[PDB]
């Protein structure tokens, strides 16, 4: 069943620099040795990204807005982050999407889930055999009226408690599809997202077609002999963190190398130099002066001035005339 967790330190949210992260392949077309200009929903360069912690005492799994699409990144070594919940009211009154990577299978379902106020998974540590096993799945109370279901091939997670693994995702809800892009890279940082460029390849286009305005991240708890108490307080968490940014209708210049891999990109609305680079369709600019855009002052008010008359037009006497 559902249980509310307690014993958490009331800290403020942290923020990080998105740098040049969050760029993905806009389509499924092979291109090489070319600079391609595209307009799509991308994470703006050097944007303000909300930084969530799960360390010990924090276990951040709030419900966040989805807006026009979400950039999600996780940095961890113990696989605390398992999945996400997407939807509107996030309860049994509406269709919602649940994506969870559990110890043996990845499950994607769309149902009228009655999600927990504080949903999570849990792994128990058994000192008797020094093994970690998944024992809890407390995400929802019920899951009726399912319209979509997918389960991946079986596997085994180590689930060992302990940053080594950086996992970046892009979530788009558009044209009847829930599009997921992802990239898995090594990381040696414990403070923030790395500085460098990496393009995210498409993972799956889910033929769902539901309304998503809010989402939350599903984290796994660790329970051991060192965590006495009840299901609400008798827990800890392996060090982990994740970042959430939002996508914007931005124009990007993407650089494809010989192998057709995107190796760089320019955010055309980041600054006047990037704007120049996009204008010239080049990642370099020669000495000189270039016209790249136009300046225009925008209106701040809307002024409507009609004749000050109150009498209504005699249409009714035409429509309800005794004789035509």
């Amino acid at each position, epitope marked *: 069943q559902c*249980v*509310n967790l*307690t*014993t958490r330190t009331q800290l403020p949210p942290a923020y990080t620099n998105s740098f040049t992260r969050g760029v993905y392949y806009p389509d499924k077309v092979f291109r090489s040795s070319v600079l391609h200009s595209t307009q799509d929903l991308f994470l703006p360069f050097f944007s303000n990204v909300t930084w969530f912690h799960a360390i010990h005492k924090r276990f951040d799994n709030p419900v966040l807005p989805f807006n026009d699409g979400v950039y999600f990144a996780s940095t961890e070594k113990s696989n605390i982050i398992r999945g996400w919940i997407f939807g509107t009211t996030l309860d049994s009154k509406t269709q919602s999407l649940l994506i969870v990577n559990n110890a043996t299978n990845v499950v994607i379902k769309v149902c009228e889930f009655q999600f927990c106020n504080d949903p999570f998974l849990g792994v*128990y540590y058994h000192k008797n055999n020094k093994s970690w096993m998944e024992s809890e799945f407390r995400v929802y109370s019920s899951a009726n009226n399912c319209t979509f279901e997918y389960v991946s091939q079986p596997f085994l997670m180590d689930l060992e408690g302990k940053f080594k693994n950086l996992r970046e995702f892009v979530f788009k809800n558009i044209d009847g599809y829930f599009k997921i892009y992802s990239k898995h890279t090594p990381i040696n940082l414990v403070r923030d997202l790395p500085q460098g460029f990496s393009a995210l390849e498409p993972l799956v286009d889910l033929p769902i077609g539901i309304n998503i305005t809010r989402f939350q991240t599903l984290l796994a708890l660790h*329970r051991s*002999y060192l965590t*006495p*108490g*009840d*299901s*609400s*307080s*008798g*827990w800890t968490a392996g060090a982990a963190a994740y970042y959430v940014g939002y996508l914007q209708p931005r124009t990007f210049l993407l650089k494809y190398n010989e192998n057709g891999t995107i190796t760089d990109a320019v955010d055309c609305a980041l600054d006047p130099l990037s704007e120049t680079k996009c204008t010239l369709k080049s990642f370099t600019v020669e000495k000189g002066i270039y016209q790249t855009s136009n300046f225009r002052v925008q209106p701040t008010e809307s002024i409507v001035r009609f004749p000050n008359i109150t009498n209504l037009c005699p249409f009714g006497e035409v429509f309800n005339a005794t004789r035509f």
Partner: antibody
Framework: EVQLVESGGGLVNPGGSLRLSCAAS????????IHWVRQAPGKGLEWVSS????????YYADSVKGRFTISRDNAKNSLSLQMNSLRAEDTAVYYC???????????????????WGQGTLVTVSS | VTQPASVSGSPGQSITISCTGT?????????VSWYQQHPGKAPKLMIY???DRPSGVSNRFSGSKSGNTASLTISGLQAEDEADYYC????????????FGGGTKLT
């Protein structure tokens, strides 16, 4: 040395109310579930109620359910039991006891009482 | 949970106290515990989880379970053993709760 100290007992009239307390020391109060058990004169032990470490899980015996309210303060290391609309049938020695199961997230239903207080007598009569 | 009113025997002998319940109490729930209560004193835990002994408890006390009846065997009976022994177990019903046995007087 683990100790539990009951207080707030005494003689009350039927139809009245009485608040009992149990102070805790020698262990981390906030890590354990604490139960109340009562023993009528000449009788055996009867389980009354329990409150989990987070206070989220509370149980009452049917005989007291709806009349008794249990609450704890994990900052003061102190447990309280409020008995309303009490009757002559409620005369008993009330003990607080520490649940020996430190892992209620594994087997919540598995209850044992490792430590008991001295017990405070509550008499309902006039 | 049903218990004998009392048990007795010579010093040095092994006495078995039994607690008979049902499938919802003793059979399917191996959480049976035993307590020793001396006159005027609070009870103390002697056995838990059917056969497990708390530290500080002498090894003369051991429990067991067969079907719906649990038992406590006290070997090498000592004069100091005389006490009221109670069972406690989890009972599955419309509302989950815990119960004690009638209590067996050991003389």
């Amino acid at each position: 040395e683990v100790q539990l100290v009951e207080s707030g007992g005494g003689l009350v009239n039927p139809g009245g109310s009485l608040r009992l307390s149990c102070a805790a020391s020698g262990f981390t109060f906030s890590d354990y579930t604490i139960h109340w058990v009562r023993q009528a004169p000449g009788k055996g032990l009867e389980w009354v109620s329990s409150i989990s470490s987070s206070s989220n899980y509370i149980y009452y015996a049917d005989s007291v359910k709806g009349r008794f309210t249990i609450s704890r303060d994990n900052a003061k290391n102190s447990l309280s039991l409020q008995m309303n609309s009490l009757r002559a049938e409620d005369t008993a020695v009330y003990y607080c006891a520490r649940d020996g199961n430190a892992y209620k997230w594994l087997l919540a239903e598995n209850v044992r009482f490792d430590y008991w207080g001295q017990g405070t007598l509550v008499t309902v009569s006039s | 949970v049903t218990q004998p009113a009392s048990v007795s025997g010579s010093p040095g002998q092994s006495i078995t106290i039994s607690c008979t319940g049902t499938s919802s109490d003793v059979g399917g729930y191996n959480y049976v515990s035993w307590y020793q209560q001396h006159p005027g004193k609070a009870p103390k835990l002697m056995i838990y989880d059917v056969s497990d002994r708390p530290s500080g408890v002498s090894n003369r006390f051991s429990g067991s379970k067969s079907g719906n009846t649990a038992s406590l065997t006290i070997s090498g009976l000592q004069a100091e053993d005389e006490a009221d022994y109670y069972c406690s177990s989890y009972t599955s019903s419309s509302t989950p709760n815990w119960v004690f046995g009638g209590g067996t007087k050991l003389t």
